[PDB]
Amino acid sequence: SPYAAPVRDHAGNLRDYLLAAGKATPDKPAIVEPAGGLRFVSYRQLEAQADAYAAELDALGLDVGDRVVLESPATADAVAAFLACFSLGLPFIPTIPETPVQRLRTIIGMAAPALFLQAADGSREGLPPGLGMARFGPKGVTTEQLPAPRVRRRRQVVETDPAYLIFTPKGVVMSHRANIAFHRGIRAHGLIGPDDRVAVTSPFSFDFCLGGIALTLASGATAVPVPRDRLDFPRRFLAFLHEAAITQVHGVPSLWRPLIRHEPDLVAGLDPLRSILFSGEDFPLGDLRELQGLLPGRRIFNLYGATESMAASVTDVPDPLPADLERLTIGYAHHGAEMDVYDAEGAPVGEPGVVGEIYLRSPALFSGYWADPEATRAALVPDPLLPESGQVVFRTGDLAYRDADGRLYFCGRI
């Protein structure tokens, strides 16, 4: 028995990190979804479901490292499933039913998953016989086809293990440690508080969906995935933001164009909404100004980055946006990271205004591209300022210049 009181470490696995804050509020809603009206799954319930799923998945005999394709719209049960995978050390590839079968077959050949794990309702066609197949739903995990037998060689998942893979086509491999470092850094900025209820508009196959849900949970708040049958219909989407009393909306900029154009009075009437987080797409500034105009006193955030780090920087949009302003800054890397601009010879750009390639120094970097050491080595390079250390840095493929204060401005891809 321990000499002194153990101090429990919650940063070793996404399963632990994402649920730590919620320990203080087990009965608070973690996920909200449509039921009649709305259904809530509490922190406590979400963990119970994660744990139940994990026990049944673990009976399949898969080894730490084995990939699982997880196909489902974003729902409370899909969240329990990805948490269960995290706990077992089974990196998953998130997919949706609408993901084209040709892409799905490409994923399966590149990553060779041992299990295809779909929703209760799932009816995916085109799968290779006999790839392990299972369903998850309210009652648990039922297995239609057992995965192949194997001998297990790993004892225990650790934070350097892969947590998930996202295919861009290249397989971005993200460790626990890296994604945990991301959430740790971003929470230092206070984007989400426990009172928030966060509408995640992006589909489950998108990096931003998992990120949004993860960060929301990690921050002890309430995550509200917006089902696609609310989201593609403006009036239905806007009513949902009221019904679920949404305080923060995550989405691409273009999400808002139809809502401004067709239903500006309803947008203006979103009383519970305090904040909006965008990413993944250039926002025409006229549209943004229009949006600020309809939603005065809202905090809007601009999120720059890529799958390889989940994200890299987060920037307040000024209200009001100056009339002369032509390009929104991407600011400084998020807390715990650093980015700067480099010339074609690998030296740091000496002067403001001069365009170079963004190199990202961060604990949140991907581990590599799956089965592709040469693409890994071109993206993850020895620190150009100190190659002796062993530290690596990420060549983003993004162009940008710096202002006098050291903030960057995005200028496109190479």
TrEMBL record:
GO terms for biological process: amino acid activation for nonribosomal peptide biosynthetic process; secondary metabolite biosynthetic process. Residues 22-370 form the AMP-dependent synthetase/ligase domain. One of its GO terms (cellular component) is cytoplasm. It comes from the Bacteria. Keywords: ATP-binding, Ligase, Nucleotide-binding. Signal peptide: none annotated. The keyword Ligase applies. One of its GO terms (molecular function) is phosphopantetheine binding. This is Nonribosomal peptide synthase. The gene is cmiS6. The chain holds residues 2 to 423 of 527 of the full protein.
